[PDB]
Amino acid sequence: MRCLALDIGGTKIAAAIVKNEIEQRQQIHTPRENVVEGMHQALGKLLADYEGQFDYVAVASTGIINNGILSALNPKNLGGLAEFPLKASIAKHTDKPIGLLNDAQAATYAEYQLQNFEQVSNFVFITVSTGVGGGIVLNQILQTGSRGIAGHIGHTLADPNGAICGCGRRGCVEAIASGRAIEAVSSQWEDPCDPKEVFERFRKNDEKATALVERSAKAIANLIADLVISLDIQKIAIGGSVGLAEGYLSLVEKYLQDFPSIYCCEIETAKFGQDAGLIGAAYWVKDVLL
Amino acid sequence: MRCLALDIGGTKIAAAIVKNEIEQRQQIHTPRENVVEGMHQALGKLLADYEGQFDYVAVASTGIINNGILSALNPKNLGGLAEFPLKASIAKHTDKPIGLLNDAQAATYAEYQLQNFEQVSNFVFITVSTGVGGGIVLNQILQTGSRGIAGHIGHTLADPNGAICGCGRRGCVEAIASGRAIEAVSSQWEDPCDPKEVFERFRKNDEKATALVERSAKAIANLIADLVISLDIQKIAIGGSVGLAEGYLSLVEKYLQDFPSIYCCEIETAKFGQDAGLIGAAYWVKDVLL
Ligand SMILES: Nc1ncnc2c1ncn2[C@@H]1O[C@H](COP(=O)(O)OP(=O)(O)O)[C@@H](O)[C@H]1O
Ligand SMILES: Nc1ncnc2c1ncn2[C@@H]1O[C@H](COP(=O)(O)OP(=O)(O)O)[C@@H](O)[C@H]1O
Ligand SMILES: CC(=O)N[C@H]1[C@@H](O)[C@H](O)[C@@H](COP(=O)(O)O)O[C@@H]1O
Ligand SMILES: CC(=O)N[C@H]1[C@@H](O)[C@H](O)[C@@H](COP(=O)(O)O)O[C@@H]1O
Ligand SMILES: [Zn+2]
Ligand SMILES: [Zn+2]
Fold first, then answer.
1. Ligand 6 centre and the CA of B242: distance in Å?
2. Topology (CATH) of B1-116+270-290
3. Cα(A202)–Cα(A190) distance, integer angstroms
4. C-alpha B102 to ligand 4 mean position (Å)
5. Which DSSP symbol is given to B165?
6. CATH architecture of B117-269
């Protein structure tokens, strides 16, 4: 009835109790150097700050999540960490059941619970956050796949002539549209800035920042097209701090109406924010303990 | 128990009885001019050549198939035909039940019946034929989607700087890897030839034909990668006359091993050939009459 939720990410490693709402939120510095020891200690402190306060642990986590292990498809999103015994480290601190699930899959399970269930049977949530991640609901069932890969739509093809992605594959969507991909360009400018800063020189109509935010949305627009015509998607919410940025969804919708109408789809802002992973894992774990 | 199967395509409009094997095959000229009248008359003749010989009709057909209508996503694959009352025209000639299904979805349902069902739960068949088509089995269930679009993987993104596709979208996989896409290049040569001819100047190591068959496989290789990492696919058979061409699958497998191993997948030749659509529709219709 009472859940300890963790949203492990590249930037955000959240934690919260989910009674039926979020409460007692925390938000640690997801470590970017000495990360193997750093994540053991963070999982230790957070597990201590809540002992006896929960009946199960629900972990939404960046990376492929499979038999308790976190395999980082893109190690650049984890300070270099290729792998991590996620469930084990957590079990060193509590006896309660522990469910684990990719972070984007957890959000898509959250956002899907706000949808008219027989108007919308195929659904996709797209986070444009640190990287680019997704989860795929088909016939109301969240897809995870036999290895927990299903949903890793940020490493589908964006441009066969584009940047090498941190995963080793050329031209991924993540390598072109992600917060990381934006920052790789905006740091090397004569007038450097971080992603949030790119979004405001964008609104002031700086050529450079607009060309860069457009490159990202046009790629996300193409991702949605691929999704619509491959799986017959009926609605797409997009989350993440770049996705939820102001004026971005409009730029996606704009680039999406260059496509034959058949590729179009209803797109909405994620209605759960930085708390979609927590809430998703909390409900998704609970519903596969029944 | 006795089925009249039709495989409607861009080049091939087949027909056959499926008792439990194919028999009495036919193979008409899929008309490329005056096609609306042409397809009514072909559906008339074939329905007459078999009256009383079947208990139901099963139609595998190129195009989105939805409430009896064939909507051509790419009208160039149908001699211009944007739409066709497929089921209606067939009902003008028999009282028996009539099931309809996209052609690539029908093949993927065939080929999937030859698979170890709990070694392989996510499966994809890719036809590299006139165009590029697919069907997606997830958790042993063939995906069609609420509008029969699911599987139209030939109109996912291949190159955002490539040819406009006959569907209206820039850079589709079909526009780069299909038999049509090959022929559009090999006709305009100083020494023109058809696709089959491209595959033999290829084997004799003609620069031009190799550059062209490589462009197609490298794109199919990228499609498989997208499929593996999006949906956690476990095996992929590829059919169609370009797919089944000799030395092509090897070129796909070759370009696929440039990818991080996580993107790799077991790939096999389709083991049903020009009869996968017929057999697929025949079994798939029968199993959704129970
Ligand atoms: N308010 C914001 N506006 C635009 N970009 C942001 C904003 N906040 C964070 N970002 C960028 O988004 C990325 C982090 O996304 P976020 O969802 O917060 O992290 P996580 O991947 O852990 O879920 C970073 O690249 C960051 O620069
Ligand atoms: N033996 C072959 N070898 C190479 N290419 C072929 C061969 N036969 C047909 N093609 C080409 O494949 C395309 C037709 O594929 P096919 O599966 O026969 O038709 P359909 O789309 O109706 O199922 C055409 O472009 C044709 O040029
Ligand atoms: C470590 C890793 O390879 N993660 C991949 C996904 O599994 C993840 O869901 C996505 C978004 O995660 P986020 O950006 O941290 O929110 O980023 C990456 O593509
Ligand atoms: C008319 C039309 O838009 N058809 C599309 C698909 O539905 C079809 O399955 C695929 C392969 O069909 P084939 O090449 O005729 O075998 O080609 C096209 O992309
Ligand atoms: Zn990648
Ligand atoms: Zn197309």
1. 18
2. Nucleotidyltransferase; domain 5 (3.30.420)
3. 16
4. 8
5. P
6. 2-Layer Sandwich (3.30)
